[PDB]
Design a protein around this ligand. Sequence first.
Ligand SMILES: [Cl-]
Ligand SMILES: [Cl-]
Ligand SMILES: [Cl-]
Ligand SMILES: [K+]
Ligand SMILES: [K+]
Ligand SMILES: [Zn+2]
Ligand SMILES: [Zn+2]
Ligand SMILES: [Zn+2]
Ligand SMILES: [Zn+2]
Lengths: 406, 404
Amino acid sequence: QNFADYFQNKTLRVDYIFTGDATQQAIYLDELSQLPTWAGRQHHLSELPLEGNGQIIVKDLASKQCIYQTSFSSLFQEWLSTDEAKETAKGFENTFLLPYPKQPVEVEVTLYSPRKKTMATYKHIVRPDDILIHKRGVSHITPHRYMLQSGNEKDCIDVAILAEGYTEKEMDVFYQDAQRTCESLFSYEPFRSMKSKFNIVAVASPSTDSGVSVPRENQWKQTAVHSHFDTFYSDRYLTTSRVKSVHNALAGIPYEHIIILANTDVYGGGGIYNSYTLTTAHHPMFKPVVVHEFGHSFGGLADEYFYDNDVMTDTYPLDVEPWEQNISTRVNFASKWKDMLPSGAPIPTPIAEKKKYPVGVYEGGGYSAKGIYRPAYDCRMKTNEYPEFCPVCQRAIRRMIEFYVP
Amino acid sequence: GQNFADYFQNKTLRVDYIFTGDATQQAIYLDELSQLPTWAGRQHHLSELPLEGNGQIIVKDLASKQCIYQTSFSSLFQEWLSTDEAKETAKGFENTFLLPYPKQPVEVEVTLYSPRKKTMATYKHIVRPDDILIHKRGVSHITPHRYMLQSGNEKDCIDVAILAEGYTEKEMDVFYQDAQRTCESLFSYEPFRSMKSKFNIVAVASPSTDSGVSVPRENQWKQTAVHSHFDTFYSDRYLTTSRVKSVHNALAGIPYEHIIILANTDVYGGGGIYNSYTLTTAHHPMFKPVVVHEFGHSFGGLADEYFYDNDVTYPLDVEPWEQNISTRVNFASKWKDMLPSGAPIPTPIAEKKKYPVGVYEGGGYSAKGIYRPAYDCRMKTNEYPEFCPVCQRAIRRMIEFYVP
Ligand SMILES: [Cl-]
Ligand SMILES: [Cl-]
Ligand SMILES: [Cl-]
Ligand SMILES: [K+]
Ligand SMILES: [K+]
Ligand SMILES: [Zn+2]
Ligand SMILES: [Zn+2]
Ligand SMILES: [Zn+2]
Ligand SMILES: [Zn+2]
């Protein structure tokens, strides 16, 4: 499929509202926007690199031929397993980028459960001549600086680093934090060997207040992307549900993936597949932590630690193969790293034999000590203190990069 | 009588919802709870309504289920539901409401009604006042503002906020001149003129990055304080904002009950919706009568009395909840008590001098089956000098309801 067959070199941005509670879910359209260029895929348009927990399928309206596919996970889907979702139905902002069509399209959004069951589905027609498609990124483009520029937006993976909780007086600190992000990311394989496949842009989005909101301390701050601690009443969980403010700050700058830096030294943050990474820039463990989160948001990798996470409730049924590439329930292991496991390797791999098996079937991962397996004894997806991604995480990241750019 | 201090604090519980749906189904969801440092609303008549509206919010004490606060409204969402787009694409709309801040947990219930008074959507949620995720607002960086009229405190007076849309920081002297023109226009009309001491008027200089407002059909997308735009529902001159949270965020920390948004342009356009806002163009030649007509909707909850249909409401077998129009289904609930004995129904146009209060056929966008109280009114035309006697009574009732 040639890009120019159905698409223009512009972006069709779609803002949705993901709604529901523990019993029901529904999707609604908020607004359509246009970005002046298309920073995404030129190839593999009608395929997915990963299933994700959510998908967007674009079909040509006249023929119903599938012409674009993208997958993701969302903060909304984490919220659905919290105590609040049992009693109060809520709406969540969710933004996705699609190539701008030459002709009318049918856009279909689907949300899936941890058992791969359809939770909610939504179909809408987009007509490219619609005057209410909000044009963006043509004026007041946020001041920005390229930290790494390997090539144009068509040939490279565009990553945007966005300032959260930095006033105009603190932008030199932010740009230094963006340099540190770039230096940390490209110190890890396969990012290190595939550095020429990436563009890194630092976006100096100003905040009225220095720092970020801490609701439990009654510290409400006015910031660029309105992030806050106490997400789902988990003290150190720093997130933003103001996704439109994130994408509005980035309009006009080519971007595919987002890293949000919060101007604080306390611990916290997280990353979600094709959502964003958000972490505290001045915490001592920033360098390995931002890369662990990018493992989720860009790599779509799972946590390999087997201790319970606060915001992650009943995430992996043991009778279902996870869609994440670096963990397995041994339901469909041949779809995972069976092809990288040496002949005659014991399953599970005994921990005493870890030096013999850099690639094994180690019991424990995805927040469970039993029934879930990880590919190595340790990895950056397991601990912040281990030096690198395990070989299976590295292959998965190489596949993500090869999928997105030739 | 219900004392304010029995259930409430002198603070505001602001609730932001998402109103969702299409022509076949509707649903309401919570977005976020906020707190404002004072309560600018009613101190009396807490558990009653001045009008039915098309939507209601009922606040009940959680433990007893006793009704402790009621407010009614209409919404941009409910207008959108009758458009072509609502037949094919389900959408979500921002809707913000202000409630008195409770001392103890409450049950908040939102209900949306159809033009036939049928329940379209209902939503119940519990608010616990010690919830740390209630977003505190209006405590820092309060938008620069100026009192155009200050008759008294926020408890005793009706607080009206005038907000700047499409004015850069360099144009705030023009905006303050426009807010002053708004106040001068409003208080030139009865009963506002004789009840001037019941109001506070505050001009809020919310800065815009760009001068003017967005015109989608001209591909003119501007970055402004409340993100208003023309071409609402593909109606060229329909100027609105669906970014209701941005309106209320700019006003956080300033006492307000009703909102007037002034757009920095001289072209024609705007509108007002009951307990939503008024939004109009400040420099159009007909500004003075137009802003008051819109305030008739947004504050008065009055209907349009003109019989011609807009570019884009009242079933003839249903009595409208609006006080200045009737389908004569329940005419005794309207201005029957002001109609002289033996007045002809309908009142012939040739006999308009004999009947300042009649039953004139035509109103609420229909030439037949809907009736208005006078041949002409501010709610019918921009060129007529005043509100009709029935609109004036209805406005007096609104003011008397809100403040002693
Ligand atoms: Cl800000
Ligand atoms: Cl994820
Ligand atoms: Cl109305
Ligand atoms: K790219
Ligand atoms: K008041
Ligand atoms: Zn993680
Ligand atoms: Zn790994
Ligand atoms: Zn009107
Ligand atoms: Zn009238």
